[model samples]
Target: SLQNAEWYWGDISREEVNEKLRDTADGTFLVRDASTKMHGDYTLTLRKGGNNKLIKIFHRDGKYGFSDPLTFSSVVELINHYLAQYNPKLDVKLLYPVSKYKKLHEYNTQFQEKSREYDRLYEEYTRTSQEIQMKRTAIEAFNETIKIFEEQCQTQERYSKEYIEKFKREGNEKEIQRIMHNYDKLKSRISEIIDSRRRLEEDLKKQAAEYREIDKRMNSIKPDLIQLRKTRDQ
Candidate 1:
């Protein structure tokens, strides 16, 4: 229900809101969503010079702006009104939103944080290198086996063709069928080797792709980490 206002920081703590309001102008404030646990009264966190003031806002019985005067119907509406006019009791001029500070600090932390995440992200590069090498070893073994299979397959086809024709000349039909059956088994076995070779090619490609992604991340992380650290530390 308290969903429409940008200044309404729902469920955020006082310290967090205080951090948001830091180094802002006097009377800069925001509304934190009041849970029923806190008697359903929202806390108005305002920066008054160097100090902060936490005041409970009672929008009792659907009336807003606090303590029965009920200047407006909604806290957002009441807050909107307060921006136009100063509160005499609070004795502070209502400044505009503290949102700029919040946004700057929010993305502020995240951008700065990217610096360190690259450290572990760079580690992901190193970890994947192991898989890349291990997979290469597997591909190497498959390569040798596939080469051997090709040699045997070609030679078997060559000799079988020649022998069958030679037998055909000799009119040995029964023996021709036996050698033909052996060639059939050799051809089927070679087909599996061909399929295994194709499968290993794709498997080799996958680890290389992951390694490239980590390398890309390494370049990106360096600039972000270096730039952010320089700006912050300097």
Candidate 2:
């Protein structure tokens, strides 16, 4: 009976079987049984030398299957035939405490989810920190620009007073008018610079407040993230 079943696939020979079977490090086998009543495929996995019996079997509908080793042996003959024709090689490895496989699978899936969430929060914190730094840089530049302009305005005012006094003594109205016009221009520019500096100061304050909020959020999550890593590792 075994010999007849094994030889069912007429043209496939034993030599082909040994070649395909030797690479057993690949632990999975898939076979399509067209004549099945459920119209589903069979999935079989055989372990290495330590496992002589079938360790796992399932249908496409997710139902497990079982049969005598001879039945599996006969099926392998067909599997070997298909392997030679359509699929040639399979390489897969199995992990152990076979009892805990499903639990480990679930744990791995959850760890990925938590890892993504943690990364999102960290990136947000980093982005906010950069925003605050940029605001500080803007404020510093604004302050420097204001200092330079203020110094220029003071020097120009002193020159304007001296020119007005000198022009008055010389009675040159045209020169006095020209110097006063430029002094007015300096005042206008100084006003705009001061306005810009105030705006930047306000903006800096707002950014500092926002930075505190982000820092609070980052701090709040610190313990939880640490705990998450610990639990995932365990």
Candidate 3:
């Protein structure tokens, strides 16, 4: 019977239940006899943040449960079912059963649970910082590498320019036509090298943008982790 259920507080008002659950951990809850607004119903008063969630449980036909089709033979059975996991109707699972007769020190849990969140944040910050360093070094190295390709491009252009100049000079109408018909092998070779440099330049643009975004991620994670560590220290 609900009389023996530790989670049931008979004839408790909304204000009383809220006070019992206020400043408490999330998911802490108790079943209480509801007011006329929910005539003949029970209140599944649950703690969340400031504004608690109230799920109405119906008591009719000698069965008790939430508004859903699933009903129980007793209120204890209903509370027991939700204690294990969240009911589909509830935003959070009912846990840490609140008893009216129990002392606040015995039932209340007021403590910090930041270590899990802080640990995860620290890992993210460390990884983000290292990735930022890795990205900066790689981008700097590639920028320097682009210079070598630029020098190759400059030398290749010079040879190709001279070849064009030489071609114009050593030309009659028939000779010019014959020379144009035959490919300039060295000029074609430089064109291939210039195309390679263009590809490298495009790659540099992509890598630079990626570096900018990862640096922003590092900035975001660093401050949050710092705040977490500060609270943990205290």
Candidate 4:
């Protein structure tokens, strides 16, 4: 939800406060200020709807929660700041030009329209692949932890199939199931990302080729502009 929320707390650490501020600053998309309760019973303030501010939650006198705040600024400023502070592949001049941006937006729109199918496929594929990896890691960690627990019990008698089964049964079931489902889903998603990526690449190549052809067309049009200029001179 893009709803405005305020954070309240007391005695926030310099590091923690700055860290939260940094996150809010980075996400210029959503920033809210501290309310009085946000300052640990001092005074909760809600601007109702103009500017948003940042409040760190850790320093509150053992209490804190969320509150509604005011309007938020768009992320354009944050984007501009980051773009200036960090070197981007595309600079504002080339990226912001109306003609260029329009063309790129068209390309993006096409990609997005075509992307839903790809998303449905890729998410399953990638998710299952990562889940499988996670399952392997989890099993290994469980085994190690079991060994540690065994050492704690100081007897092989403590090692029981029932206990191990219960541990896996209660906690690992959803993870295992999700992994299996994703495993089945991912095979098609890989093809989708690859196919979509290729299609977009080809489409862009075609666009570039057409742009070059248009340059030739413009050259052809120059003769008319030249002839018109000559008539004006006469």
Candidate 5:
């Protein structure tokens, strides 16, 4: 009777539902018929849930319909709950309550806020660390340049004295002028290098101090962040 009962029961019979459910333990199936519409305007599907089937009624915008594996028991409970809003009914127990969903959403929101703050602070910490490294590199480069410039200035000073003596004894103006130009240039460059080193030293000190402050702040927040992440996961 089941196989022969095909279109006799309705557009879709019990046989077709059982067959489709067997093919896809959890899947969507369309029921079609000219009596119903062109291609089956009706859709059926089973979602993961408890041992028993539960039908869900959804209303969106202006359209509304019933969908699912059709759990009669849960449907009755839901209907009773809805009726209670108009009249009076017994207190119903739910497997997954709305209050739990609300709590989980709240927890997730809090977790996201904490995560954003932690990420922002971490970026600042990294930026400060990079700045300190750059400042230290510049300071080292300047110190090396100053040392080299000081050596060149010393050599130039000795040669300048020798040139003065030579010019006075032999009256060689050309040689003395060339030596004096180089000596003066060396002195000017050394003065510039010394000034650059002083300024760089001050900048390095400020960067180092800033790095320490950022590091301290990151450390302070880390434990709180870790605890919040664990709580969210749980």
Candidate 6:
């Protein structure tokens, strides 16, 4: 019998269990008929059984019967301790009782609560980060628009000045009027871009402050992550 013989759905003889385990150990595919289910409706080849009333295989007798699954993680922990005795690092044996499982359960509860809280904070940070990026993009776009409009205005003003000079030099008023119209249009567009940039600057400043606060909290989460890993290792 294997350490995990009871994970199967149906009972089988010791020889039968060994035969299957051997086949699996040898990296060969073995199939069994579905007499029970443990988790889902699929026929289990390796992982799960569909029904909960699955038989357990006892290693001592090589016989199988229905048995309950380990409800608490402490049972698995106890087994790990027992198995770890063979290792030199854990030479000292630690006695495991139901009380040990209770302590672990309490710790797990705390861990779950903290994990959920951390996730909530992280979600807020993500939302705030996106908001800041969007606002920054808006500011950049407004700046570019302003820059383009200013360049156009400067070019139109220069062209009008040149036309005025030519009108004075050659006594032609048509070129001067044509250049004046273009200059007026350019001035109007430039004023619009400048107004847009001013409004966007106010919102962008607020968004930047929000992003800085979120980043501070995100950095604080690094310590919590380290603590979680330490607890898991223990």
Root-mean-square deviation of every model? 14.8, 13.6, 12.9, 27.8, 16.7, 12.9
Cα lDDT listed for each candidate:
0.71, 0.53, 0.62, 0.38, 0.53, 0.51
- Residue 162 shift from truth in candidate 5, angstroms: 2.0
lDDT of 2 by residue, 11-64 (tens): 333343343344444343222232334543333333454332223333433323
Q: Whole-model lDDT, candidate 3?
A: 0.62
* Candidate 4: regions farther than 4 A off: 1-179
Top lDDT prediction, candidate number: 1
lDDT of 6: 0.51
Residue 17 of model 1: what lDDT? 78
Question: For each candidate, how many residue pairs have backbone atoms clashing (under 3 Å)?
Answer: 0, 0, 0, 14, 4, 7
List TM-scores for all candidates, in order: 0.43, 0.47, 0.37, 0.24, 0.49, 0.41
Candidate 5: residue pairs that collide: 32-40, 53-71, 54-71, 55-71
Give candidate 3 misplaced runs (Cα > 4 Å): 37-39, 83-91, 101-234
Q: Which ten residues in a row have the lowest lDDT in candidate 6?
A: 46-55
lDDT of 2: 0.53
Residue pair clashes in candidate 2: none
Tens digits of per-residue lDDT, candidate 3, 139-200, equal 56665665665566677666756776676777543454455443464456546656665665
Candidate 4 lands at a TM-score of: 0.24
10 residues in a row with least lDDT, candidate 5: 92-101
Candidate 2, residue 12: lDDT: 32
* Residue-level lDDT tens digits of model 1 in 1-234: 344566776668867776667687777878886656435677787777587777677755677775657767766776765632445656666776754325345545756568567767877888788877887888778778878867887887788878767878785567888776776877788788778867877877987997898898789777766555445432
lDDT of 6 by residue, 51-82 (tens): 11112322222222213332223222323323
Cα misplacement distance, residue 2 of candidate 4 (Å): 82
Estimate the TM-score for candidate 3. Answer: 0.37
Please give, for residues 1-234, the per-residue lDDT of candidate 4 as tens digits.
112222323334334434333322222322323344533223221121222233232333332332233122331222223222223332222121111005344434534443444445455555655655555565455555545544544432245434545557675555545444543545454455455545655555565565455455445555654444433323
Model 1 residue-pair collision total: 0
Give me the candidate number with maximum TM-score.
Answer: 5
